[PDB]
Design a protein around this ligand. Structure first.
Ligand code: CLA
Ligand code: CLA
Ligand code: CLA
Ligand code: CLA
Ligand code: CLA
Ligand code: CLA
Ligand code: CLA
Ligand code: CLA
Ligand code: LHG
Ligand code: LMU
Ligand code: PQN
Lengths: 73, 165, 124, 144, 40, 80, 742
């Protein structure tokens, strides 16, 4: 998110990381992208654009929201 | 013109389309003889193609950016700009035939309900009666309206079976 | 009655089955569990080692395959245990009872893991 | 008429056997026995599949469910004109008799029978489902 | 002959003749007036 | 067990009793029809829900009705 | 000792149109006329169910015999049309001169509504639809060289068609054979073995020896067709025949003096394919039909009719009695002489299996000239005769169950082979059930294993030739054995029967006619798919036959009949228990299994056999991608269905544009069928009630009460549309593809 907010036009958002022991090495390399540590999925739900529009700018902004909603749950 | 369309007679894409179709036919032509059977058939096709493109332009149709005729359905726009023959006039052409067929069938169905065995008059058609009703259907719009005003077109609500409610 | 057939009713077949651990009555359920577990556990290592994802590694193939065979025996032991819980909640053989089956499942785990370990020792 | 008593030693038809016979249910829950008298030896069709020869005199068969017994009863009655009767037998040894419940086949009206599950109304006079709601269980308007 | 003409009056026979006639009329019209798109 | 109900439009044709493949129904005396007999359902615990009885009833609407209910070994028609 | 003799009845029935005007006359139920629309469907459904109209076997047999004359008369009209259209609307004469460059065509369309574009450029100064029926190759092999010869056959075909319809009328209304006549099975086999097959083979050998061989010998030499001697000149002038085949100079003396080796020049045993035309040697084909003629003529003298010598079929059956099978084949003779359905069940089973065998042998041993290099004809003929065989086999199950319900009588069957089979049906179905589950996992699971390993980037873990291997060692051994047969086991054969076993390819006109076919891991996997889908089809059909009369669910299923929808929602639900429904389900699986068979054939041939021969070597249509790609489901989707459907979807604006339209239309009919399969008539009867109300409101309600289709007709309508749409979709896809590239 923090990298995407800088250049949203030319960066693919990341949904979450992949830990699949069944993967082969070509699969691990194939899904590594976006400057991530390892394989990741690209987000398609638009939460990046939504959260960026409503004022979120850093990962700590998302962390506080996550704990707040877990408490509300 | 209407909705940004242009007359096909003035459309550049429309003219180019005719050349493409004729060019395709001409390409096949040059592999035959002058007056062989295949050559004559191909020449006949080209004549119809040229006639078709002249007729549509002469009819004053509208062509889009695709260079293909488009039809106008609004009665006001059709009568305003002389496109009544695309949809509006054919609308009343179909309904006359559709009502003709339906009215003739309804007359025959009522006619045989009076017979002793109506079911056998449906699988085995009473051709003399059907031909008689076929000709009298030409005036169905007049007969149809008069039934409506006299109240004999519809059954009574009390004579129609319905499910529990 | 039922359709008689040599396979269903033959002398040679009947004697062979009567000597199997499952049908050999008079033996404690735990001991039968160990005897059955050892046989299956020993065989279970074969396919994992030869056709596993790490089969082409020189030395890791033996360890990885056997370690996966041990895991499957553990899962099977759970299946045996819960089956006894569901089936026996309230007859001639002690095995088909709540007390007998629980001992049987425990023996299978001990025998099965021993068989997997014994299979590994054969390789190295 | 008095309730017949089953004779377990009754001879059974000449049948080789099949795989369509009794299962473990017969040993744990129940099974059914059908008996009848045969005028002459004849071939009939087993509801479980195959053909069997009925001995002259008493015959006895065992089936896995009631419908199988009453399927054979229809054959014997309609085609060979016999009069069979069958029971329900439990693993504990108890024997329950039925069909004919009172000795007369149900198709024929007999005095002494008491009407059961008879509603003195038409189907169209049942109440609406809303009026039998929250009655403790799913209840149709026909039940009340 | 009365029965034979009765057979020709059966529904399948009438439909075959009727649609054969109807189809022929439409085919012939398009043979002499090819490519009709607008009443004109 | 299924629920089987006999309604007062029965004409005592006996066709439902003949059709039933499990001897669930029987005929009993009655005074509400010309035949002076009515169908009865004393053994519904053996009913399987085939609805052969409803197929055989001449009256309109049916005079015998089957409402499928709780399942069991007998009503599910199992031999195992 | 009832003598075998002709027995008929005079004027059994009167020829009148009275009953033509009374629909339903044949059945008591439908004779009263219609009250609901259900009557109309019942009229057509039961029209040919003779066994249910009357209980008299003699009356049933007479209708069957004449209904067969009507079928023969229809085939002659169809055959006459094919020969006539070849004479008048084909480019056959031009094709004879340049067979390798001119596409066969025998259908021409009229110039209306712009459909004349379907008259494509096929060659020979001719415009028409290209045909894949292979009639041009058949006519060339027989020696037809002019449209006059085609025209005369068509006229003869119509005369035969008229004779067939006269025979049907004569043998039903004038002189109808009696029941005792129909039951001479020994006599019928004698005439049909030695008379129909035997003399038919000998007569055709006469045509080949005297017409086909001389004409095709000159055609292959390059002689202009118009300059070849006419067939009657070859027959009348032994001098001409001697020039082509010197053996004719000796007449028929060698035949009667047993010097049969004199005829070695035109009665050969070469084997292989003719290099000039790419088809089987006609001299080999003539010796085949001469040998077959003698074998069948001997076969026709086996059964005893009127003169003591011979076999009694009843005695043979009753003598074959073993320890494991109780009574044995006792009672089968009475079953097979009193049940038409039992006879039909056997004949459909083997006739269908024969049609499938024809498909395999004709492609591997192309019997006609220029058949092999015409890839459209090869693909069409193999696919056509596989579908015919598939439907016939499913019918065999249908009519085996009809026998079991209607014609089966326990009194005649006690402890015989038939009875004992019924008494362990649970053992049979339970074992066949397990085999299908085993075959489904270990054949289709391998494809799922490969697809997952490939998607995970683990190609080394796949089942393939470059990975874990599954070689058809048994099939490969047989291919090598047949390749070396001429050396030791068939010394007098010059070449192997087919070029599929091995050796060198034969190329005609720059295209491969046939070459060795290699079997690898992909072939191993696909073959075990065939075994899986065939075994499942047997399970469904065999289950229906064995449980037609009763089961543990419906103990009295026979009384319900052969074709009923259910026995109600009781016992949990009994939908589709009747034996008719096992045919209904069996049709889907037969369609599923044969679709893979014709996809296997189409991809394997294009990838490994068909192609263009050039200086460097053979380049195949799909470039040998079968071996590496057909081991995953994704490979079939991408490389076969997606890539090869390019031709059909780009057909608009060309002569093949018709296949594009039918490709879409077939997709439509298939999806339309799911409406009938996924729904039930309860919804539709209520829908019609509201529709009928509108008609009642307008005094236009019909006298024949509308009814939703029955439960069974919904299933029949569903499967018929499902099959038509699915099969027509492949039909368009195959022809537009192979015609475009092949
Ligand atoms: C199916 C519905 C429908 C719709 C969406 C339209 C839409 C249109 N019609 Mg059409 N029309 C229809 C049915 C419809 N019509 C029918 C059934 C008839 C009778 C056979 C007509 C007869 C008709 C005429 C005579 C005229 C239009 C015109 C129009 C345009 C503007 C006025 C209008 O109708 O506003 C929206 C439509 C409706 C609310 C439905 C009723 C419309 C009535 C029947 C016509 C109204 C004409 C209007 C008073 C003209 C004022 C001058 C105009 C330049 C502003 C518009 C494109 C006018 C035009 O050519 O404009 C360029 C015009 O002169 N229509
Ligand atoms: C919604 C359905 C629909 C409609 C509205 C049309 C309409 C038309 N089609 Mg199309 N068509 C359809 C479905 C349809 N089609 C389908 C499903 C197919 C596939 C089979 C085709 C295939 C097709 C072809 C191949 C052709 C057409 C053509 C035509 C034109 C025929 C005009 C004619 O015959 O005048 C004849 C004049 C008449 C008056 C006929 C009626 C006669 C009665 C007696 C009049 C009585 C008056 C009182 C017209 C524009 C033709 C064309 O040129 O289109 C541009 C043409 O060649 N259609
Ligand atoms: C191969 C096709 C074929 C053949 C050989 C037959 C043969 C027969 N049909 Mg069948 N039929 C067929 C297809 C066929 N049908 C199809 C596709 C249907 C639609 C589902 C029907 C529907 C049908 C009905 C409804 C009836 C028959 C009847 C008959 C019988 C008398 C026909 C007769 O006298 O013709 C005489 C033929 C000629 C004089 C030839 C010239 C005239 C024709 C019309 C051309 C005969 C056994 C009738 C019967 O009695 O069945 C027991 C009967 O009622 N058929
Ligand atoms: C299996 C049988 C069969 C089939 C499917 C066809 C099909 C066809 N024939 Mg052929 N035909 C056949 C047998 C058959 N024929 C036989 C046995 C003869 C010998 C009498 C002929 C003689 C014949 C002629 C003389 C002609 C055709 C023509 C046609 C075409 C148009 C038919 C049409 O609409 O007529 C009109 C429809 C009705 C009268 C109804 C069509 C492709 C025509 C054709 O291809 O023209 C280019 C044509 O001229 N056929
Ligand atoms: C003109 C001559 C003639 C006449 C008047 C009759 C009259 C009679 N026949 Mg006879 N019959 C004839 C010729 C004739 N037959 C011939 C040529 C044959 C040999 C096939 C037979 C074989 C025959 C049999 C086996 C039977 C009769 C029967 C009958 C009776 C009823 C027939 C009926 O309802 O037909 C009406 C039926 C039709 C009009 C259907 C015609 C079917 C033909 C074969 C055409 C098939 C076309 C095919 C489906 C095309 C493909 C369709 C696709 C394109 C959609 C009646 C006494 C029946 C009888 O006596 O029952 C008690 C009976 O069982 N006939
Ligand atoms: C059924 C198949 C068949 C038929 C019909 C023929 C027919 C013929 N073959 Mg062939 N042939 C066949 C199979 C056949 N062959 C096979 C399988 C082989 C391989 C072994 C051969 C090998 C072969 C050879 C090597 C030769 C022939 C030859 C012939 C011709 C002369 C035979 C001869 O001398 O007959 C002798 C006599 C008869 C057959 C009897 C004729 C009886 C007549 C028809 C009776 C008419 C009676 C009547 C009342 C009179 C009319 C009265 C009326 C006008 C009023 C003849 C056209 C010869 C030939 O000429 O080849 C070009 C020849 O050399 N064939
Ligand atoms: C030699 C072949 C043969 C023969 C002589 C018969 C004969 C018979 N079969 Mg059998 N059958 C066969 C093959 C054969 N079958 C095959 C191959 C199958 C597998 C599909 C079956 C499956 C089968 C079933 C499931 C049943 C029969 C039944 C019957 C009996 C009545 C048939 C009837 O009334 O049809 C009347 C004919 C029709 C209603 C016409 C059907 C039209 C089809 C569905 C059209 C399909 C599309 C078309 C071919 C192409 C497109 C058309 C175009 C207009 C779009 C009769 C004894 C029935 C019976 O009761 O037997 C005791 C029965 O239930 N057969
Ligand atoms: C793609 C669709 C599809 C599939 C997968 C199946 C599957 C099956 N059908 Mg069915 N069927 C279908 C469509 C399908 N059918 C349709 C459309 C119809 C209507 C005409 C029918 C009608 C029908 C009938 C009438 C019959 C079958 C039968 C069968 C079975 C064949 C034997 C077997 O067990 O194979 C093995 C099973 C498979 C190949 C399924 C896929 C297995 C995967 C690839 C591997 C296992 C997964 C693995 C354990 C991982 C799971 C992880 C997860 C738990 C987290 C099987 C269960 C026959 C049967 O029951 O035979 C015993 C049978 O009689 N089908
Ligand atoms: C093989 C089995 C042959 C068996 C064989 O030839 O048996 C021979 C034996 C014949 O015994 P009889 O000598 O008594 O038979 C006299 C005959 O004339 C028939 O009356 O047949 C049977 O016992 C029938 C039941 C066999 C049951 C077989 C069960 C296993 C089926 C396996 C199917 C595999 C299919 C593979 C296809 C490639
Ligand atoms: C069942 C049996 C069916 C048999 C049908 C036979 C039909 C025969 C038709 C052809 C007649 O011709 C058959 O006999 C003629 C007379 O011997 C032979 O004629 C040959 O020998 C003649 C001897 O004088 C010469 O004059 C001829 O030039 C020469 O061709 C033909 O080579 C042979 O093919
Ligand atoms: C659509 C559908 C229907 C409704 C379909 C019906 C009633 C068939 C309609 C057939 C035709 C279209 C109606 C009869 C047409 C007449 C012959 C008149 C035609 C006159 C000219 C136009 C030719 C069922 O009845 C049904 C039953 C069981 C399972 C599924 C379904 C199902 O899916």
């Amino acid at each position: 998110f923090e990298q995407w907010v800088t250049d949203p036009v030319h960066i693919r958002p990341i949904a979450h990381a992949i830990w699949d022991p069944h993967f082969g090495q070509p699969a691990v390399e194939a899904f590594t992208r976006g400057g991530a540590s390892g394989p990741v999925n690209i987000s398609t739900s638009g939460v990046y654009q939504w959260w960026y529009t409503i004022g979120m700018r850093t990962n700590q902004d998302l962390y506080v929201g996550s704990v707040f909603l877990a408490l509300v749950s | 013109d209407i909705a940004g369309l242009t007359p096909c007679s003035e459309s550049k894409a429309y003219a180019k389309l005719e050349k493409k179709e004729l060019k395709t036919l001409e390409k096949r032509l040059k592999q035959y003889e002058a007056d062989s059977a295949p050559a004559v058939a191909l020449k006949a096709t080209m004549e119809r193609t040229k006639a078709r493109f002249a007729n549509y332009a002469k009819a004053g149709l509208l062509c889009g950016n695709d260079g293909l005729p488009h039809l106008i359905a609004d009665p006001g726009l059709a009568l305003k700009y002389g496109h009544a023959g695309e949809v509006f006039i054919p609308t009343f052409g179909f309904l006359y035939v559709a009502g003709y067929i339906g009215y003739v069938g309804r007359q025959y169905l009522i006619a045989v309900k009076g017979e002793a065995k109506p079911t056998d008059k449906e699988i085995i058609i009473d051709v003399p009666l059907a031909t008689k009703l076929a000709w009298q259907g030409a005036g169905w719009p007049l007969a149809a309206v008069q039934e409506l005003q006299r109240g004999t077109l519809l059954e009574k609500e009390e004579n129609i079976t319905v499910s529990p409610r | 009655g039922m359709l008689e057939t040599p396979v269903t009713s033959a002398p040679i077949v009947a004697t062979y089955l009567s000597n199997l651990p499952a049908y050999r009555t008079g033996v404690a359920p735990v001991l039968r569990g160990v005897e059955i577990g050892l046989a299956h556990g020993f065989l279970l290592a074969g396919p994992f080692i030869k056709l596993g994802p790490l089969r082409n590694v020189p030395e890791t193939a033996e360890i990885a395959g056997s370690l996966s065979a041990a895991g499957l025996v553990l899962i099977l032991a759970l299946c045996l245990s819960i089956y006894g819980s569901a089936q026996f909640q309230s007859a001639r053989d002690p095995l088909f009872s709540a007390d007998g089956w629980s001992e049987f499942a425990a023996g299978f785990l001990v025998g099965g893991e021993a068989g997997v370990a014994w299979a590994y020792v054969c390789t190295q | 008429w008095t309730v017949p008593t089953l004779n377990p030693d009754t001879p059974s038809p000449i049948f080789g056997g099949s795989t369509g016979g009794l299962l473990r249910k017969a040993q744990t829950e129940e099974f059914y026995v059908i008996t009848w008298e045969a005028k002459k030896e004849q071939i009939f069709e087993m509801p479980t599949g195959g053909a069997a020869i009925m001995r002259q005199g008493p015959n006895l068969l065992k089936f896995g469910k009631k419908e199988q017994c009453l399927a054979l009863t229809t054959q014997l009655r309609n085609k060979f004109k016999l009069t069979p009767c069958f029971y329900r037998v439990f693993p504990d040894g108890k024997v329950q008799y039925l069909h004919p419940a009172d000795g007369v086949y149900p198709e024929k009206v007999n005095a002494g029978r008491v009407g059961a599950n008879q509603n003195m109304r038409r189907i169209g006079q049942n109440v609406n489902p809303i009026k039998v709601k929250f009655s403790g269980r799913m209840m149709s308007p026909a039940e009340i | 002959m009365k029965d034979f003409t009765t057979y020709l009056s059966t529904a399948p026979v009438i439909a075959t003749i009727w649609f054969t006639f109807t189809a022929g009329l439409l085919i012939e019209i398009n043979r002499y007036f090819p490519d009709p798109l607008v009443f004109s | 067990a299924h629920i089987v109900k006999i309604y007062d439009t029965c004409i005592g044709c006996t066709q439902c009793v003949r059709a039933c493949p499990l001897d669930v129904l029987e005929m009993v005396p009655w005074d509400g029809c010309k035949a002076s007999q009515m169908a009865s359902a004393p053994r519904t615990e053996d009913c399987v829900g085939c609805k052969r009885c409803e197929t055989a009833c001449p009256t309109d609407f049916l005079s015998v009705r089957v409402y499928l209910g709780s399942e069991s070994t007998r009503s599910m028609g199992l031999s195992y | 000792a009832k003598k075998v003799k002709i027995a008929v009845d005079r004027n059994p029935v009167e020829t009148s149109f009275e009953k033509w005007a009374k629909p339903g006359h044949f059945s008591r139920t439908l004779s009263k006329g219609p009250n609901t629309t259900t009557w109309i469907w019942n009229l057509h459904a039961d029209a040919h169910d003779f066994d249910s109209h009357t209980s008299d076997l003699e009356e049933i047999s007479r209708k069957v015999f004449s209904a067969h004359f009507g079928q023969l008369g229809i085939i002659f009209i169809w055959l006459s049309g094919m020969y006539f259209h070849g004479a008048r609307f084909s480019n056959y004469e031009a094709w004879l001169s340049d067979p390798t460059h001119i596409k066969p065509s025998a259908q021409v369309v009229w110039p209306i509504v712009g459909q004349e574009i379907l008259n494509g450029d096929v060659g020979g100064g001719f415009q028409g639809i290209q045909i894949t029926s292979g009639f041009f190759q058949l006519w060339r092999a027989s020696g037809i060289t002019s449209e006059l010869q085609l025209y005369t056959t068509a006229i003869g075909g119509l005369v035969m068609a008229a004779a067939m319809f006269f025979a049907g009328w004569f043998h039903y209304h004038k002189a109808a054979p009696k029941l005792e006549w129909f039951q001479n099975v020994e006599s019928m086999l004698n005439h049909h073995l030695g008379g129909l097959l035997g003399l038919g083979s000998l007569a055709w050998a006469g045509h080949q020896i005297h017409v086909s061989l001389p004409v095709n010998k000159l055609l292959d030499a390059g002689v202009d067709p118009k300059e070849i001697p006419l067939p009657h000149d070859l027959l009348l002038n032994r001098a001409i025949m001697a020039d082509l085949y010197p053996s004719f100079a000796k007449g028929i003396a060698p035949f009667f003096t047993l010097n049969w080796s004199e005829y070695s020049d035109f009665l050969t045993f070469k084997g292989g394919l003719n290099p000039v035309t790419g088809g089987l040697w006609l001299s080999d084909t003539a010796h085949h039909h001469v040998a077959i003629a003698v074998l069948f003529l001997v076969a026709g003298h086996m059964y005893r009719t009127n003169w003591g010598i011979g076999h009694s079929m009843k005695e043979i059956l009753e003598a074959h009695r073993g320890p494991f099978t109780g009574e044995g084949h006792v009672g089968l003779y009475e079953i097979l002489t009193t049940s038409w359905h039992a006879q039909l069940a056997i004949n459909l089973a083997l006739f269908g299996s024969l049609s499938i065998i024809v498909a395999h042998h004709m492609y591997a041993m192309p019997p006609y000239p220029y058949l092999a290099t015409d890839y459209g004809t090869q693909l069409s003929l193999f696919t056509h005769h596989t579908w015919i065989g598939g439907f016939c086999i499913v019918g065999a199950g249908a009519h085996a169950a009809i026998f079991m319900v209607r014609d089966y009588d326990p009194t005649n069957n006690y402890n015989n082979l038939l009875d004992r089979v019924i008494r362990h049906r649970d053992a049979i179905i339970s074992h066949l059930n397990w085999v299908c589950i085993f075959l489904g996992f270990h054949s289709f699971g391998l494809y799922i294993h490969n697809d997952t390993m490939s998607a995970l980037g683990r190609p080394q873990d796949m089942f393939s030739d470059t990975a874990i291997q599954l070689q058809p060692v048994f099939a490969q051994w047989i291919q090598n054995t047949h390749f070396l047969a001429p050396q030791l086991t068939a010394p007098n054969a010059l070449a192997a029967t087919s070029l599929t076993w091995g050796g060198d390819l034969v190329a005609v006109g720059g295209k491969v006619a046939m070459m060795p076919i290699s079997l690898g891991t992909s072939d191993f996997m696909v073959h075990h798919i065939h075994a899986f889908t065939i075994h499942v089809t047997v399970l469904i059909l065999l289950k229906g036959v064995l449980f037609a009369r009763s089961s543990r669910l419906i103990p009295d299923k026979a009384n319900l009949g052969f074709r009923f929808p259910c026995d109600g929602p009781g016992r949990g639900g009994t939908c589709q228990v009747s034996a008719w429904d096992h045919v209904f389900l069996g049709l889907f699986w037969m369609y599923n299994s044969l679709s893979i068979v014709i996809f296997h054939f189409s991809w394997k041939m294009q990838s490994d056999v068909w192609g263009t021969v050039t200086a460097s070597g053979v380049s195949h249509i799909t470039g040998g991608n079968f071996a590496q790609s057909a081991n995953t489901i994704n490979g079939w989707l991408r490389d076969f269905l997606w890539a090869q459907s390019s031709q059909v979807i780009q057909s608009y604006g060309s002569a093949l544009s018709a296949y594009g339209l039918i490709f879409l239309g077939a997709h439509f009919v298939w999806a339309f069928s799911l409406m009938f399969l996924f729904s039930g008539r309860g919804y539709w009867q209520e829908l019609i009630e509201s529709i009928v109300w509108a008609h009642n409101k307008l005094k236009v309600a019909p006298a024949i009460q509308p009814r939703a289709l029955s439960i069974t007709q919904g299933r029949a309508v569903g499967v018929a549309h499902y099959l038509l749409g699915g099969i027509a979709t492949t039909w368009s896809f195959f022809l537009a593809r192979i015609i475009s590239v092949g």
